[PDB]
Design a protein around this ligand. Structure first.
Ligand SMILES: [Ca+2]
Ligand SMILES: [Ca+2]
Ligand SMILES: [Ca+2]
Ligand SMILES: [Ca+2]
Lengths: 108, 108
Protein backbone atom coordinates (compact mmCIF):
# COMPACT_ATOMS: atom_id res chain seq x y z
CA UNK A 1 0.00 0.00 0.00
CA UNK A 2 1.10 3.54 -0.86
CA UNK A 3 -0.31 4.90 2.42
CA UNK A 4 -1.40 3.32 5.69
CA UNK A 5 -1.89 3.95 9.41
CA UNK A 6 1.82 3.31 10.00
CA UNK A 7 4.75 4.02 7.66
CA UNK A 8 6.71 0.91 6.57
CA UNK A 9 9.95 2.75 7.31
CA UNK A 10 8.98 3.37 10.94
CA UNK A 11 7.94 -0.28 11.30
CA UNK A 12 11.30 -1.36 9.85
CA UNK A 13 13.16 0.91 12.29
CA UNK A 14 11.13 -0.27 15.31
CA UNK A 15 11.75 -3.88 14.32
CA UNK A 16 15.45 -3.33 13.72
CA UNK A 17 15.84 -1.74 17.15
CA UNK A 18 14.55 -4.86 18.92
CA UNK A 19 16.24 -7.56 16.81
CA UNK A 20 18.24 -8.84 19.79
CA UNK A 21 16.62 -11.41 22.08
CA UNK A 22 15.20 -9.62 25.13
CA UNK A 23 15.66 -6.11 23.71
CA UNK A 24 11.93 -5.55 23.16
CA UNK A 25 10.09 -2.81 25.04
CA UNK A 26 6.47 -2.13 24.02
CA UNK A 27 6.58 1.58 24.85
CA UNK A 28 9.67 2.06 22.69
CA UNK A 29 8.10 0.03 19.89
CA UNK A 30 4.77 1.90 20.02
CA UNK A 31 6.66 5.21 20.04
CA UNK A 32 8.83 4.33 17.06
CA UNK A 33 6.04 2.92 14.85
CA UNK A 34 3.91 5.96 15.65
CA UNK A 35 0.98 4.18 17.29
CA UNK A 36 1.14 6.17 20.55
CA UNK A 37 0.27 9.33 18.60
CA UNK A 38 -2.78 7.84 16.84
CA UNK A 39 -6.50 8.16 17.54
CA UNK A 40 -8.33 5.72 19.80
CA UNK A 41 -9.95 4.27 16.65
CA UNK A 42 -6.57 3.71 14.99
CA UNK A 43 -5.30 2.13 18.20
CA UNK A 44 -8.33 -0.18 18.12
CA UNK A 45 -7.64 -1.10 14.49
CA UNK A 46 -4.16 -2.20 15.57
CA UNK A 47 -5.85 -4.38 18.23
CA UNK A 48 -7.83 -6.28 15.58
CA UNK A 49 -4.69 -6.95 13.51
CA UNK A 50 -2.87 -8.45 16.54
CA UNK A 51 -5.95 -10.51 17.42
CA UNK A 52 -5.11 -12.96 14.60
CA UNK A 53 -7.72 -15.59 15.47
CA UNK A 54 -10.54 -13.01 15.98
CA UNK A 55 -11.32 -14.16 19.54
CA UNK A 56 -11.72 -10.50 20.54
CA UNK A 57 -8.72 -10.80 22.90
CA UNK A 58 -4.95 -10.85 22.46
CA UNK A 59 -3.77 -14.12 23.99
CA UNK A 60 -0.19 -14.72 25.14
CA UNK A 61 0.47 -16.71 21.95
CA UNK A 62 -0.44 -13.67 19.83
CA UNK A 63 1.94 -11.53 21.89
CA UNK A 64 4.64 -14.06 21.06
CA UNK A 65 4.14 -13.30 17.37
CA UNK A 66 3.39 -9.58 17.93
CA UNK A 67 6.33 -8.41 15.80
CA UNK A 68 5.21 -10.57 12.84
CA UNK A 69 1.90 -8.71 12.57
CA UNK A 70 3.98 -5.60 11.79
CA UNK A 71 6.77 -7.25 9.82
CA UNK A 72 6.15 -10.79 8.53
CA UNK A 73 9.76 -11.92 8.81
CA UNK A 74 10.31 -10.78 12.38
CA UNK A 75 11.41 -12.99 15.27
CA UNK A 76 9.16 -14.36 17.99
CA UNK A 77 9.31 -12.61 21.39
CA UNK A 78 11.09 -14.62 24.08
CA UNK A 79 9.04 -16.02 26.98
CA UNK A 80 10.44 -13.29 29.26
CA UNK A 81 9.35 -10.60 26.80
CA UNK A 82 5.88 -12.07 26.27
CA UNK A 83 5.31 -12.54 30.01
CA UNK A 84 6.34 -8.95 30.81
CA UNK A 85 4.16 -7.68 27.95
CA UNK A 86 1.17 -9.68 29.24
CA UNK A 87 1.70 -8.55 32.86
CA UNK A 88 1.83 -4.92 31.73
CA UNK A 89 -1.41 -5.02 29.77
CA UNK A 90 -3.47 -7.58 31.66
CA UNK A 91 -5.10 -5.29 34.25
CA UNK A 92 -7.88 -7.75 35.17
CA UNK A 93 -5.57 -10.78 35.49
CA UNK A 94 -7.54 -13.05 33.13
CA UNK A 95 -4.46 -14.08 31.12
CA UNK A 96 -5.29 -12.06 28.01
CA UNK A 97 -5.51 -8.47 26.76
CA UNK A 98 -8.96 -7.07 25.93
CA UNK A 99 -9.68 -4.02 23.75
CA UNK A 100 -9.82 -1.49 26.62
CA UNK A 101 -6.67 -2.91 28.22
CA UNK A 102 -4.98 -2.55 24.85
CA UNK A 103 -6.16 1.08 24.49
CA UNK A 104 -4.96 1.78 28.04
CA UNK A 105 -1.64 0.00 27.34
CA UNK A 106 -0.84 2.08 24.25
CA UNK A 107 -1.93 5.37 25.90
CA UNK A 108 -3.40 7.24 22.92
CA UNK B 1 -4.23 -0.35 4.98
CA UNK B 2 -2.58 -0.86 8.38
CA UNK B 3 0.86 0.02 6.98
CA UNK B 4 2.07 1.74 3.82
CA UNK B 5 4.94 3.73 2.29
CA UNK B 6 3.52 6.92 3.84
CA UNK B 7 1.61 7.33 7.11
CA UNK B 8 -1.97 8.65 6.71
CA UNK B 9 -1.34 11.09 9.55
CA UNK B 10 1.63 12.68 7.77
CA UNK B 11 -0.41 12.92 4.56
CA UNK B 12 -3.23 14.59 6.51
CA UNK B 13 -0.79 17.08 8.05
CA UNK B 14 0.89 17.88 4.71
CA UNK B 15 -2.51 18.41 3.12
CA UNK B 16 -3.78 20.55 5.98
CA UNK B 17 -0.71 22.79 5.75
CA UNK B 18 -1.43 23.68 2.11
CA UNK B 19 -5.23 24.05 2.27
CA UNK B 20 -5.05 27.73 1.30
CA UNK B 21 -4.96 28.62 -2.40
CA UNK B 22 -1.34 29.26 -3.42
CA UNK B 23 0.16 27.92 -0.18
CA UNK B 24 1.54 24.76 -1.81
CA UNK B 25 5.28 24.12 -1.93
CA UNK B 26 6.42 20.70 -3.20
CA UNK B 27 9.55 20.56 -1.03
CA UNK B 28 7.52 21.25 2.10
CA UNK B 29 4.92 18.68 1.05
CA UNK B 30 7.51 15.99 0.23
CA UNK B 31 9.24 16.68 3.56
CA UNK B 32 6.05 16.44 5.60
CA UNK B 33 4.69 13.26 3.97
CA UNK B 34 8.10 11.63 4.35
CA UNK B 35 8.83 10.99 0.68
CA UNK B 36 12.16 12.85 0.65
CA UNK B 37 13.56 10.27 3.09
CA UNK B 38 12.50 7.23 1.05
CA UNK B 39 14.46 4.96 -1.28
CA UNK B 40 14.71 5.65 -5.01
CA UNK B 41 12.34 2.69 -5.55
CA UNK B 42 9.76 4.13 -3.15
CA UNK B 43 10.10 7.50 -4.87
CA UNK B 44 9.46 5.75 -8.19
CA UNK B 45 6.37 4.02 -6.77
CA UNK B 46 5.02 7.47 -5.89
CA UNK B 47 5.64 8.47 -9.53
CA UNK B 48 3.38 5.68 -10.81
CA UNK B 49 0.55 6.70 -8.45
CA UNK B 50 0.66 10.33 -9.70
CA UNK B 51 0.79 9.12 -13.30
CA UNK B 52 -2.96 8.36 -13.18
CA UNK B 53 -3.41 7.61 -16.89
CA UNK B 54 -0.27 5.39 -17.09
CA UNK B 55 1.32 7.43 -19.90
CA UNK B 56 4.69 7.06 -18.16
CA UNK B 57 4.84 10.83 -17.60
CA UNK B 58 3.22 13.26 -15.17
CA UNK B 59 1.38 15.80 -17.31
CA UNK B 60 0.39 19.26 -16.07
CA UNK B 61 -3.18 18.02 -15.57
CA UNK B 62 -1.97 15.34 -13.16
CA UNK B 63 -0.02 17.97 -11.23
CA UNK B 64 -3.28 19.88 -10.91
CA UNK B 65 -4.78 16.92 -9.07
CA UNK B 66 -1.51 15.98 -7.30
CA UNK B 67 -2.98 16.43 -3.81
CA UNK B 68 -5.92 14.10 -4.60
CA UNK B 69 -3.59 11.16 -5.24
CA UNK B 70 -2.55 11.51 -1.57
CA UNK B 71 -5.90 12.54 -0.12
CA UNK B 72 -9.00 11.97 -2.28
CA UNK B 73 -10.91 14.98 -0.98
CA UNK B 74 -8.13 17.51 -1.48
CA UNK B 75 -8.36 20.67 -3.56
CA UNK B 76 -6.93 21.16 -7.03
CA UNK B 77 -3.68 23.15 -7.29
CA UNK B 78 -4.12 26.64 -8.75
CA UNK B 79 -2.67 27.38 -12.20
CA UNK B 80 0.17 29.33 -10.55
CA UNK B 81 1.01 26.36 -8.32
CA UNK B 82 0.84 23.83 -11.16
CA UNK B 83 2.96 26.00 -13.46
CA UNK B 84 5.65 26.53 -10.82
CA UNK B 85 5.61 22.80 -10.02
CA UNK B 86 6.00 21.92 -13.72
CA UNK B 87 8.80 24.47 -14.25
CA UNK B 88 10.69 23.07 -11.26
CA UNK B 89 10.57 19.45 -12.41
CA UNK B 90 10.58 19.76 -16.18
CA UNK B 91 14.36 19.84 -16.79
CA UNK B 92 14.12 18.97 -20.50
CA UNK B 93 11.33 21.46 -21.27
CA UNK B 94 8.96 18.95 -22.92
CA UNK B 95 5.94 20.04 -20.86
CA UNK B 96 5.81 16.95 -18.64
CA UNK B 97 7.71 15.22 -15.83
CA UNK B 98 9.42 11.91 -16.60
CA UNK B 99 10.56 9.31 -14.04
CA UNK B 100 14.15 10.60 -13.72
CA UNK B 101 12.99 14.22 -13.48
CA UNK B 102 10.63 13.12 -10.73
CA UNK B 103 13.43 11.28 -8.87
CA UNK B 104 15.65 14.36 -9.25
CA UNK B 105 12.79 16.64 -8.13
CA UNK B 106 12.14 14.73 -4.90
CA UNK B 107 15.88 14.37 -4.10
CA UNK B 108 15.95 10.95 -2.42
CA1 LIG C 1 -7.08 -13.68 19.82
CA1 LIG D 1 -7.22 -9.03 30.68
CA1 LIG E 1 0.34 10.56 -17.15
CA1 LIG F 1 10.26 16.72 -18.97
Amino acid sequence: AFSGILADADVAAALKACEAADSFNYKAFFAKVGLTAKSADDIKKAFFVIDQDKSGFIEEDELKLFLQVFSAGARALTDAETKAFLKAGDSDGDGAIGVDEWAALVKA
